[PDB]
Design a protein around this ligand. Structure first.
Ligand SMILES: [Mg+2]
Ligand SMILES: [Zn+2]
Ligand SMILES: [Zn+2]
Lengths: 48, 137, 49, 39, 113, 32, 67, 133, 56, 394, 147, 263
RNA sequence: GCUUGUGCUGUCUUCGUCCA
């Protein structure tokens, strides 16, 4: 259990900068965040 | 009005031009020379009215092979357009709406009464016929 | 719709007849089992009351 | 109803186009049938 | 669902080099260059510039698949010259041509305005 | 006045440097 | 539904010429002449304005759902 | 160096279906009964009826990968207007003095009919045809 | 219905398209289908590094 | 339906949601890309993978035991392009030659000498196709009793994998027996044969991409002289049918043995009308130029035939329902627009217009009747054929 | 509208498509091999008439059994400054060189059908089984297997 | 050696002639101007209220296609190359639209002139939506009746047409060479006579027609290329041409740098 | 001191898709 599951998040670095998302899966640093407009889920490190 | 049983006893002209007695692009009409004279009793209002709703959408159906007309009559009911103008207040199981419907550039006169110009179900695309890269075979 | 069914199917009820002129569409018909049994009214057709 | 300006303009355009079509198409058809008759 | 990101056509990954050169040992003095995140725009320009050089005996390119943004070039030169030097000369020559073309266009635009 | 009211000889002077039955003018409300 | 911003084939901005087109048709110009006046030369752009159906006018006749 | 030389007069030019390829028939001025049928490229070497051509056949151009010729080097081809390279796919040892040689220049076909004396040396795998006008 | 023919696991279905740049014995497979389907590979000393990379 | 409907392929992971096939395997699968779907099965064991890769693989299935001939060939625009590129008057410059040579995976890095060396180096399309053919292949075919100089560029001769003459088309790279594919399969094995498919497809696809090929409305339009000839043929046939009608109505008709007077009359009228359509179509097909696109497709053998040209340009012909002319569904007539007891060709289902010219409403209805017959026949015979196949298999 | 159905094989960007001398690129490229066997001459006639109508600002009348002929449409198209049979000179997008063949080019009315690849794609490794037979269930929605 | 001659010049279109250049160079210039010249376009849309009859993604797509002024977009940075947190003034421009219908009758049109620039780079001429005149209303975005309001906040970013066609500065580039077909690069389809069945090119009077007795010249190459560049208003035509040349030069210099660094 | 939960109906009917 991480305190960041099912919470609104924003991406600050990389090719998806400034996109609003929701954290769905968080095992080891590679948070899985669904994107509000593109109907897809992408992996991303917690640093971003 | 005449039904199928009364049609067996009448003589119908196809067009009003048929009531009065060498181009390589114009279609050729029957001579009907077996009889010396003809006494028509009725005349068709327009020959294109023998088609239904789905076949009235086809442009130039008399230049097509008939199975392709049947295939288009089947497929035209699966095209995506605007089924009703109140789709926002309706709650249907499924519904598809096209962003930018366009009316066709080639239309038939029967499309006037089918409201196809007001609720069209397609778009005019610029089409080339070419073997470009082998990805359209 | 013509209720003849699937059993004992024959070409003759499914055929486009001469008397169909001006009353049912010669083109619109479903593909497959209901070919020729399901018909569609022509544009100027009517049904007696 | 309080119709919009664009809709009223389109209605006027439709009436004008219907009248123009009813004149021109009928005249062209008459010219074509008389030419086909005189041949 | 399976559509790749559109920025992958031109953004170079960190672990993917822009340019990979391997020799073609079948014939003497030939190399195979693999260009990443490029297409016909650079390939055709380089090919038809190189094809006019007297010391270049073979030059060609192919885009293997349109769904992947890369092309591969084959270049063969004379004994005296090395193919990489010919490629550098071609790049410099096209840059000079574009420079004088831009100068003349600016001159003519200023004249006509 | 219009092109019809023009004299036929002056109409002959209007030379491009006839309508056809199959080119309709577009509509928006149709009929039925 | 509403006039597209760009031509599908080439991308010329045609979304600023709908009201002028309706005005020109009101004045009595033919559709081809009206399209010529709006400087739409390629038939790809002429198709966009000539075949557009304005469905938003029908959608706006329903009462708003929020006030 | 060269294997055969002669001078021919064109009896017929048959264009046929093609726009760029013509079939010419010729007979040697010096030695009759030596016929020549040949397909040529019209655009780069047009020929008319009753023209005189100098046809030469050689197995080499000297005096494996092809390359554009440097201006400095020189070859037999510099003296002629039209040069082709083909393969011999049939050497017919027919009658007492009737020999037919069939060559194919990438699909452009040639048949040289003649006597054994002249065409004895044409039993090669590849041949160049050099034409001057 | 259940002995001479049955429904099976490890199978996929989708629309087919043409590809001029594929070999005769090749088939193009979508990435989602490749992620869904699997093959059980036995861990040996010839492939342990590649398999643990896959597991990571 | 047969064992070539299940073949083992090699996986290539690609974007987008479709399965992708080489176009030469669409014939054994009987598949096209207008909405078809196909299934995929993954083996789960080493033994099962070996069975798939050594027994069911696509190269091993090129030649079928049913007719001892290949089931896979060059098709569609590759066939059209290989016909267009191997014509006698096709020449290629050095730069395009270098590109096409680099496109060949099996090319050995040695550029062949050009067919013409002076004044300008030009290669032919036969050389570029011969690059894709493996060495050691010999093939020889004779068409119409042609000689070894091949004036019409027909026949075929390949020596050591090099084309000497002959336009490469359906008779050489199709699926028929004795062609190039069968020879390469027998001589070099399945792997080289599959590489031959890939090489030919890549070279021809590049050349066709940079050459182009289209079709338009003008390709179905015959000149005025041919249209006059076709009209004269159809009118003469109709006069002949009128004479036959008069003879049958005055008891002056010869009776075919084993058949009644009505049956003989119907057969003779049908034979006359069929000959009329064939003559008009032959005139139309002889009129066409070499640059005609429909003619190019028909001559390549990739799509279309003589009847398609005949119906598009000259005459659709006689419409048959159940092997006979249009019956009298009304009281002694076919439609209420004719009079009673009318045996003229137009009254009983002869379409004298072409598709380009346009059908009249009577012809339209008769043609629709014939098409409905076709659809019913297919959708009815399918179940009987399936049952027969199941009983044979069991 | 003539029974010519198909699926997208690939998509190309603006600069990769072939173009005409005035810069027009197609929205759609279809194969020539679809035409001769199916004999859909009405497709080509519709394309020609739609080209004329879009150039002149009219709607073409495509009612069956009329007096319209291909030659009248061709004369109208020729008077507008185009080739009378609908052909155009086109250029290769990759190289900028002219194509040796001319391309039939014009507007055609297409429609999008309800069958999309993302509503049909389906794979199963393992999953739910039937209670009675313990075999995979049927249907893509239920995560079923193939038969 | 290369020469440029300008035939017609305007803010939104230039018609020029290129001579003494290769065909590949002209085609690469055309492709670069079509797909690789960077502009500014709306990329992120935050919707605070939308009670119109149009879907949210419909309006977002329409907003993406609005051409914005991109004159100084060369000094801006790419969003993925900016080290800033979220969006800053050096990699984005913020626009805001707020529309509403007042009254219980009639309809209100929402135009692109209603977009107001709120923030962006300091003293750079980027961000404002393009307008033909001072009295022009712009592109029609939506229509509103009573009690319907639209309130959005848009973010404009820098990009190229390879990622999405909304970033393309050009609409259509006419391109043509050899009007009299002296190089025989095309083979003309005909019924009776090819000469009188094909319309003449618009540049046919710029070149001397071939003499009847002339023979085919196999040594000739395409030399003169005619092209017209039409822009959407986001950039001027000369700006598009110069930036296309600069983009091609930068790509070539990057190739040269990779080559030299390879050692 | 606080810890993340572990699955699915049946039977008919109709309308469709790709072959045939
Ligand atoms: Mg299919
Ligand atoms: Zn446009
Ligand atoms: Zn920033």
């Amino acid at each position: 259990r991480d305190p960041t599951l099912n919470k609104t998040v924003k991406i600050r670095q990389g090719g998806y900068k400034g996109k609003i998302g929701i954290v769905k899966e968080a095992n080891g640093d590679r948070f899985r965040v669904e994107l509000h407009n593109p109907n897809k889920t992408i992996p991303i490190p917690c640093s971003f | 009005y005449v039904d199928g049983e009364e049609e067996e006893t009448i003589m119908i002209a196809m067009t009003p031009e048929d009531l009065q007695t060498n181009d390589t692009a114009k279609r050729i009409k029957p001579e009907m020379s077996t009889s010396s004279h003809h006494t028509f009793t009725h005349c068709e209002i327009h020959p294109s009215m023998i088609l239904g709703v789905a076949a009235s959408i086809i442009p130039f159906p008399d230049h097509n092979q008939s199975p392709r007309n049947t295939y288009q009559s089947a497929m035209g009911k699966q095209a995506m357009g605007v089924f009703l103008t109140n789709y926002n207040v309706r709650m249907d199981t499924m519904a598809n709406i096209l962003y930018y419907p366009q009316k066709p550039l080639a239309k038939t006169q029967a499309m006037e009464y089918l409201k196809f110009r007001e609720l069209p179900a397609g778009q005019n695309a610029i089409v080339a016929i070419a073997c470009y890269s082998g990805y359209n075979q | 719709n013509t209720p003849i069914g699937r059993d004992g199917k024959l070409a003759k009820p499914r055929q486009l007849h001469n008397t169909h002129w001006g009353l049912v569409c010669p083109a619109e018909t479903p593909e497959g089992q209901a070919c020729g049994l399901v018909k569609n009214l022509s544009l100027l057709s009517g049904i007696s009351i | 109803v309080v119709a919009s300006k664009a809709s009223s303009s389109m209605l006027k355009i439709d009436q004008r186009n219907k009248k123009l079509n009813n004149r021109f198409i009928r005249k062209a058809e008459m010219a074509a049938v008389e030419k086909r008759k005189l041949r | 669902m399976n559509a790749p990101d559109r920025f992958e056509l031109f953004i170079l990954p960190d672990d993917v080099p822009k340019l990979k050169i391997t020799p073609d040992s079948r014939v003497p003095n030939c190399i195979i260059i693999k260009f990443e995140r490029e297409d016909h725009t650079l390939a055709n320009l380089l090919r038809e510039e190189l094809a006019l050089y007297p010391d270049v005996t073979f030059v060609a390119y192919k885009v293997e698949h349109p769904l992947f943004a890369n092309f591969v070039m084959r270049l063969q030169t004379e004994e005296g010259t090395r193919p990489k030097q010919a490629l550098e000369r071609a790049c410099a020559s096209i840059i000079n041509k574009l420079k004088t073309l831009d100068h003349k266009f600016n001159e003519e635009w200023n004249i006509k305005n | 006045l219009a092109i019809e009211n023009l004299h036929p000889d002056d109409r002959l002077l209007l030379v491009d440097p006839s309508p056809v039955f199959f080119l309709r003018r577009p509509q928006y409300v149709s009929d039925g | 539904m509403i006039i597209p911003v760009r031509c599908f084939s080439c991308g010329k901005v045609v979304g600023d010429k709908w009201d002028a087109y309706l005005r020109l048709l009101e004045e009595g110009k033919q559709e081809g002449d009206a399209l010529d006046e709006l400087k739409l030369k390629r038939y790809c752009c002429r198709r966009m304005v000539l075949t557009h159906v304005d469905l938003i006018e029908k959608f706006l006749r329903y009462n708003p759902l929020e006030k | 160096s060269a294997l055969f030389d002669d001078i021919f007069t064109v009896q017929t030019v048959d264009n046929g279906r093609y726009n760029k390829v013509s079939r010419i028939i010729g007979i040697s001025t010096t030695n009759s009964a030596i016929k020549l049928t040949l397909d040529i490229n019209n655009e780069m070497f047009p020929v008319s009826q009753d023209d005189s051509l100098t046809v030469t056949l050689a197995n080499s151009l000297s005096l494996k990968s092809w390359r554009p010729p440097k201006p400095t080097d020189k070859s037999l081809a510099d003296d002629y207007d039209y040069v082709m390279f083909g393969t011999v796919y049939k050497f017919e040892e027919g009658d007492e003095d009737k020999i037919k040689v069939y060559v194919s220049f990438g699909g452009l076909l040639m048949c040289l009919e003649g006597g054994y004396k002249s065409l004895a040396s044409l039993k090669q795998d590849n041949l160049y045809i050099l034409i001057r006008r | 219905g259940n002995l001479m023919g049955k429904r099976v696991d490890f199978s996929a279905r989708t629309v087919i398209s043409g590809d001029p740049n594929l070999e005769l014995d090749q088939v193009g497979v979508p990435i989602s289908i490749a992620k869904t389907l699997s093959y059980p590979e036995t861990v040996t000393q010839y492939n342990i590094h590649r398999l643990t990379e896959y597991v990571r | 339906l047969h064992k070539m409907s299940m073949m083992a392929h090699r996986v290539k992971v690609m974007p987008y949601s479709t399965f992708r096939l080489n176009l030469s395997v669409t014939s054994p699968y009987n598949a096209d890309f207008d909405g078809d779907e196909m299934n995929l099965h993954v083996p789960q064991s080493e033994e099962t993978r070996a069975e798939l890769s050594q027994l069911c693989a696509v190269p091993l299935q090129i030649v079928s035991p049913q007719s001892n001939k290949p089931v896979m060939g060059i098709v569609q625009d590759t066939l059209c392009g290989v016909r267009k590129m191997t014509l006698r008057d096709t020449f290629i410059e050095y730069e395009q030659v270098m590109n096409m040579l680099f496109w060949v995976p099996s090319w050995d890095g040695v550029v062949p000498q050009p067919a013409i060396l002076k004044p300008k180096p030009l290669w032919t399309g036969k050389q570029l196709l011969s690059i894709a053919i493996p060495s050691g292949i010999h093939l020889q075919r004779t068409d119409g009793g042609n000689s070894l100089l091949s004036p019409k560029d027909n026949g075929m001769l390949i020596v050591d994998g090099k084309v000497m003459f002959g336009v490469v088309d359906k008779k050489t790279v199709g699926s028929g027996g004795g062609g190039l594919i069968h020879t390469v399969m027998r001589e070099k094995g399945p792997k080289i044969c599959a590489e031959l498919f890939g090489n030919i497809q890549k070279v021809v696809n590049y050349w066709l991409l940079h050459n182009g090929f289209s079709i338009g409305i003008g390709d179905a339009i015959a000149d005025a002289s041919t249209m006059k000839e076709i009209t004269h043929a159809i009118s003469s046939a109709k006069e002949q049918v009128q004479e036959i009608i008069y003879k049958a109505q005055h008891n002056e008709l010869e009776l075919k043995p084993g058949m009644t007077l009505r049956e003989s009359f119907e057969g003779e009228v049908s034979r006359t009308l069929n000959d009329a359509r064939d003559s008009a179509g032959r005139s139309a097909e002889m009129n066409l130029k070499d640059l005609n696109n429909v003619k190019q497709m028909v001559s390549a053998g990739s799509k279309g035939s003589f009847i398609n040209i005949a119906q598009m340009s000259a005459c659709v012909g006689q419409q048959m329902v159940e092997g006979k002319r249009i019956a009298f569904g009304f009281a002694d007539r076919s439609l209420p627009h004719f009079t009673k007891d009318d045996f003229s060709p137009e009254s009983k289902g002869f379409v004298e217009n072409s598709y380009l010219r346009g059908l009249t409403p009577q012809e339209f209805f008769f043609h629709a009747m014939a098409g409905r017959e076709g659809l019913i026949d297919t959708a009815v015979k399918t179940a009987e054929t399936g049952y027969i196949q199941r009983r044979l298999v069991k | 509208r003539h029974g010519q159905k198909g699926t997208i094989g690939v998509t190309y960007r603006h600069e990769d498509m072939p173009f005409s001398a005035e810069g027009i690129v197609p929205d759609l490229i279809i194969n020539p091999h679809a035409i001769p066997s199916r004999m859909t001459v009405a497709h080509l006639i519709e394309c020609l008439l739609s080209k004329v109508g879009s150039i002149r600002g009219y709607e073409g009348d495509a009612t069956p059994f009329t007096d319209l002929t291909v030659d009248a449409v061709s004369n109208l198209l020729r008077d507008n400054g185009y080739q009378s049979r609908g052909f155009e000179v086109m250029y290769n997008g990759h190289t900028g060189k002219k194509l040796m063949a001319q391309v039939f080019f014009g507007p055609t009315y297409y429609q999008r059908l309800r069958h999309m690849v993302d509503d049909k794609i389906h794979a199963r490794a393992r999953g739910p089984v039937q209670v009675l037979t313990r075999q995979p269930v049927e249907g893509r929605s239920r995560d079923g297997g193939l038969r | 050696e290369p020469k440029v001659n300008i035939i017609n010049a305007q803010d939104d279109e230039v018609e020029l002639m290129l001579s003494d250049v290769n065909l590949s160079l002209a085609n690469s210039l055309r492709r670069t101007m079509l797909a690789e010249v960077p502009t500014l376009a709306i990329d992120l849309v935050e919707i605070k209220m939308n009670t119109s009859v149009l879907a949210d993604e419909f309006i977002s797509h329409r907003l993406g296609l609005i051409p914005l002024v991109s004159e100084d977009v060369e000094e801006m940075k790419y969003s993925r190359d900016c080290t800033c947190e979220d969006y800053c003034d050096e990699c984005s421009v913020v626009l805001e639209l707020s529309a509403r219908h007042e009254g219980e009758e009639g309809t209100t049109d929402v135009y692109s002139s209603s977009l107001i620039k709120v923030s962006g780079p300091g003293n750079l001429n980027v961000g404002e939506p393009v307008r033909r005149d001072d009295y022009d209303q712009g592109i029609l975005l939506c229509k509103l009746r009573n009690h319907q309001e639209l309130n959005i906040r848009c973010i404009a970013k820098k990009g190229i047409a390879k990622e999405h066609a909304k970033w393309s500065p050009c609409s259509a580039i006419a391109f043509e060479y050899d009007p009299h077909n002296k190089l025989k690069h095309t083979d003309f389809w005909f019924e009776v006579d090819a000469k009188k069945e094909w319309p003449d090119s618009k540049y046919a009077t710029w070149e001397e027609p071939p003499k009847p007795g002339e023979v085919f010249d196999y040594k000739a190459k395409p030399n003169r290329f005619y092209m017209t560049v039409e822009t959407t208003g986001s950039l001027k035509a000369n700006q598009v041409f110069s930036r296309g040349i600069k983009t091609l030069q930068e790509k070539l210099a990057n190739v040269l740098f990779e080559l030299e660094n390879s050692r």
